[PDB]
């Protein structure tokens, strides 16, 4: 996206890339499955803009006054996903991740 006084002109970047990886080790806060609205729209043709990733962490939570604040002198975690093995992708690259649920799952009656 090149912003100009002329206007915004989008143009392919042959040099761009994306960096994708999956947690098979569950080593980052697992944010899926809390029913937060990030999903593909029901309509194909409704573009799906991927949700940003964030995670809650707790400190020491003290009641100082009517308002409670977390001073964060403990139990505060900082996850740089930058530091982890990921796969640089670019125009013309295919990345797929296959996954299989446990066999132990119960049959949910319909």
């Amino acid at each position: 996206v090149a912003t100009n006084q002329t206007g915004t002109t989008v143009s392919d970047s042959a040099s761009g890339g994306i960096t994708v990886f999956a947690d098979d080790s569950y080593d980052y806060p697992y944010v899926l499955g809390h029913n937060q609205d990030t999903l593909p729209g029901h309509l194909p043709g409704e573009n799906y803009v991927l949700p940003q990733y964030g995670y809650i962490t707790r400190g020491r939570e003290i009641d100082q006054q009517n308002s409670i604040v977390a001073i964060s002198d403990h139990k505060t975690e900082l996850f740089f996903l930058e530091h982890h093995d990921a796969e640089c992708l670019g125009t013309g690259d295919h990345w797929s991740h296959h996954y299989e649920f446990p066999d132990d799952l119960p049959w949910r009656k319909l």
Binding site: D27, P29, H74, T76, E77, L78, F79, H83
Partner: protein
Amino acid sequence: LLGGWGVLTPPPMIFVKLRSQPGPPSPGAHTVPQSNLNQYAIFHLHYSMQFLVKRRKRSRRHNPEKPAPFPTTDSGRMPFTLANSLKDPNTPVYEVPSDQWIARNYSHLL
């Protein structure tokens, strides 16, 4: 609720007793058995226990993680050590922490 591991078949209770040595037998005269010879046994008790353990898989995080608090003694001296004198010269006072040491040391994502 109160402790480590409930077990169906626990470590057997190991029952020990002095082999009783009775006193001189009376010629069926006063019909009161002499008390057993007073005696006591002293012995080494070897007790070894093996624990299965797993090395910690550290949460992959960028923060140094504050360790579990090191024990504190009411006395202020180092815990689990022999202190020379507490208002005596006679015997050293072994010092245990003010509060129970808890085996919980480092966070892990739940």
